[PDB]
Amino acid sequence: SPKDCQVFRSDHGSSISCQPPAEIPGYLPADTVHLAVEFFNLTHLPANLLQGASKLQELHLSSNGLESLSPEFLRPVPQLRVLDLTRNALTGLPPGLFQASATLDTLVLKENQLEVLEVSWLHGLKALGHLDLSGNRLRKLPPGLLANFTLLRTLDLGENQLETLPPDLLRGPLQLERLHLEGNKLQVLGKDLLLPQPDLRYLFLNGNKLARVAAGAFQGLRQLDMLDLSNNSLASVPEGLWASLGQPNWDMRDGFDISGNPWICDQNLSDLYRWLQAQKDKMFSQNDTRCAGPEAVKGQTLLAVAKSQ
Ligand SMILES: *[C@@H]1O[C@H](CO)[C@@H](O)[C@H](O)[C@H]1NC(C)=O
Ligand SMILES: *[C@@H]1O[C@H](CO)[C@@H](O)[C@H](O)[C@H]1NC(C)=O
Ligand SMILES: *[C@@H]1O[C@H](CO)[C@@H](O)[C@H](O)[C@H]1NC(C)=O
Ligand SMILES: *[C@@H]1O[C@H](CO)[C@@H](O)[C@H](O)[C@H]1NC(C)=O
Numbered sequence: 001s002p003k004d005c006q007v008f009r010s011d012h013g014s015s016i017s018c019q020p021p022a023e024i025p026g027y028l029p030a031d032t033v034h035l036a037v038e039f040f041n042l043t044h045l046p047a048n049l050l051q052g053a054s055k056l057q058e059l060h061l062s063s064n065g066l067e068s069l070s071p072e073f074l075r076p077v078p079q080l081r082v083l084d085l086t087r088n089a090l091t092g093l094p095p096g097l098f099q100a101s102a103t104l105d106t107l108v109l110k111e112n113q114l115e116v117l118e119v120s121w122l123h124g125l126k127a128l129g130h131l132d133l134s135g136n137r138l139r140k141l142p143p144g145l146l147a148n149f150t151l152l153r154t155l156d157l158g159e160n161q162l163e164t165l166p167p168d169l170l171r172g173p174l175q176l177e178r179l180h181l182e183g184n185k186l187q188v189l190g191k192d193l194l195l196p197q198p199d200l201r202y203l204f205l206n207g208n209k210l211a212r213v214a215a216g217a218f219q220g221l222r223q224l225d226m227l228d229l230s231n232n233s234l235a236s237v238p239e240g241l242w243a244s245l246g247q248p249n250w251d252m253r254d255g256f257d258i259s260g261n262p263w264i265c266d267q268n269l270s271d272l273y274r275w276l277q278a279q280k281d282k283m284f285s286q287n288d289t290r291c292a293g294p295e296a297v298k299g300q301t302l303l304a305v306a307k308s309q
Pocket of ligand 3: 206
């Protein structure tokens with residue numbers, strides 16, 4: 001039949017995929033463990049779609065044009081581990097949506113149309129490990145957002161319109177691993193934002209409007225594997241900024257990228273020159289890391305000017 005979904009009876013249980021011309025099932029098999037319902041065109045799903053699905057662990061509801069969710073949608077699946085709502089038209093979440101969702105690990109709200117983030121929309125999440133809010137229209141983040149997510153590993157906020165970051169943004173997770181802030185409108189990075197996460201591994205800050213990094217901003221970073229600062233508006237950086245990054249302290253799994261910045265290569269960059277000389281086999285985009293001035297060295301690479309001392 002062409003109206004039936006695709007079941008894959010397996011050792012855990014079924015995995016079911018529905019896309020047109022298939023029909024959204026009115027009930028789920030009791031042993032459904034993974035459910036994907038995508039490429040439909042509906043303002044909302046049936047509020048009781050998940051009824052009885054007490055083995056469901058992963059719910060992929062990508063690209064359906066959804067504009068709202070029922071407040072009771074997840075009540076039949078307190079054991080849910082992964083909820084993925086990529087590429088829908090959500091502008092908010094109903095209150096209490098997550099009241100019984102204490103074991104949810106991954107929440108993906110990538111590419112909806114959230115313009116604000118209400119702290120109360122996440123009430124009830126506590127085991128959260130992966131929070132993906134990228135590709136929305138957020139300008140501002142409320143205080144206390146992450147304070148309960150002790151187990152948070154990844155925070156993805158890239159490709160929003162964020163103009164500032166609240167100072168307490170990283171204060172709840174015990175050991176954040178990856179922080180995606182690329183493609184926003186951030187302009188400064190303060191002394192304290194990264195203080196709660198000394199063992200952060202991945203920091204993506206590229207494609208912002210970054211003009212100033214406070215001198216102590218990286219003071220406590222002990223094991224950074226990837227630092228992307230590329231594509232910003234940095235003309236200089238203070239002395240000491242890099243003292244704990246890279247060699248000789250840490251062998252970065254990937255490295256760093258400071259390309260696409262209007263570097264001003266005078267003696268205020270000598271500390272960066274020194275640091276760059278010790279890290280060159282970890283330097284991405286070296287050919288695009290060039291001085292914007294002064295006129296004598298305009299257009300030359302940082303490394304060439306660094307090598308020249
Ligand atoms: C979805 O449904 C509405 C009304 O039926 C329609 O205007 C819209 O073009 C449809 N298709 C897509 C891709 O959104
Ligand atoms: C964190 O936990 C308390 C409940 O003890 C709650 O009042 C507060 O709203 C929670 N914060 C978030 C973002 O859920
Ligand atoms: C950085 O990267 C690409 C080009 O490298 C481009 O989007 C733009 O010049 C910079 N990023 C932005 C504005 O988000
Ligand atoms: C970057 O390197 C490519 C080839 O490696 C070269 O075309 C270019 O001249 C370099 N610098 C530029 C475009 O400023």
